[PDB]
Amino acid sequence: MAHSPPGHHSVTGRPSVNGLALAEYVIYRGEQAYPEYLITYQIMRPE
Amino acid sequence: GTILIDLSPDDKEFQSVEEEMQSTVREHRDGGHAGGIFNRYNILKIQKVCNKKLWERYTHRRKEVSEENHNHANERMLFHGSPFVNAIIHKGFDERHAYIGGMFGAGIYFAENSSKSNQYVYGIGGGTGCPVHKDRSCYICHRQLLFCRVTLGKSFLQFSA
Numbered sequence: 640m641a642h643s644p645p646g647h648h649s650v651t652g653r654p655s656v657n658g659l660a661l662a663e664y665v666i667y668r669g670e671q672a673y674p675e676y677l678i679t680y681q682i683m684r685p686e
Numbered sequence: 687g688t689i690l691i692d693l694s695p696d697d698k699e700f701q702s703v704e705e706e707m708q709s710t711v712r713e714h715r716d717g718g719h720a721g722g723i724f725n726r727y728n729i730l731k732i733q734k735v736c737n738k739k740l741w742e743r744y745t746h747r748r749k750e751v752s753e754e755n756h757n758h759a760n761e762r763m764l765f766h767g768s769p770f771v772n773a774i775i776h777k778g779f780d781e782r783h784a785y786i787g788g789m790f791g792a793g794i795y796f797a798e799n800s801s802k803s804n805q806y807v808y809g810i811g812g813g814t815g816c817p818v819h820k821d822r823s824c825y826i827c828h829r830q831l832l833f834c835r836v837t838l839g840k841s842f843l844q845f846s847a
């Protein structure tokens with residue numbers, strides 16, 4: 640796994656073209672996330 | 687050591703988690719190629735993931751980050767979709783859950799948009815879709831996402847397309 644840029648603990652990907660996109664994030668240490676909820680679902684076919 | 691507790695749909699905690707799921711669906715630039723065509727989900731179940739060891743491992747690292755960033759963990763709740771969700775909930779996140787080819791290098795990626803994480807549930811780019819029908823837009827098969835507590839600390843800001 641790579642490393643955080645020096646002096647940082649994560650990377651934020653800020654959307655710069657798709658005005659409706661929200662942010663995406665990367666961590667480089669597994670201990671920096673806890674899988675708190677398991678959500679089971681189906682996508683729904685639009686009408 | 688992991689146990690799954692089911693939340694009742696009547697519980698405010700089920701309801702706030704469902705709302706985050708539903709309200710952060712968006713349209714994607716692939717017109718639904720990777721994750722399918724949908725505006726909303728049918729939530730079938732929401733379970734709380736409980737594991738003392740993985741939790742303590744998370745809070746230990748959280749305190750370290752916090753102490754290197756003026757007592758600010760910069761903690762978020764973010765989605766994660768992965769073929770490896772069963773390994774994750776039992777064994778924790780590790781380098782086997784990393785996206786080697788991701789835009790910001792080899793790490794573990796999370797999304798504010800549930801629909802973005804949905805694109806990775808059957809693999810990178812949606813893989814070959816659901817196991818049963820080979821359909822990236824399957825409306826039948828059950829999918830799973832994780833809603834995760836994530837420590838960002840000082841985050842390097844990448845402006846990007």
Ligand SMILES: O=c1cc(-c2ccccc2)oc2ccc(F)cc12
Binds near residue numbers: 662
């Ligand atoms: O939830 C995600 C899972 C994954 C993922 C990638 C490779 C293997 C397993 C999961 O990639 C993402 C990329 C961007 C993003 F915003 C979210 C994700």
Ligand SMILES: [Zn+2]
Binds near residue numbers: 818
């Ligand atoms: Zn299917």
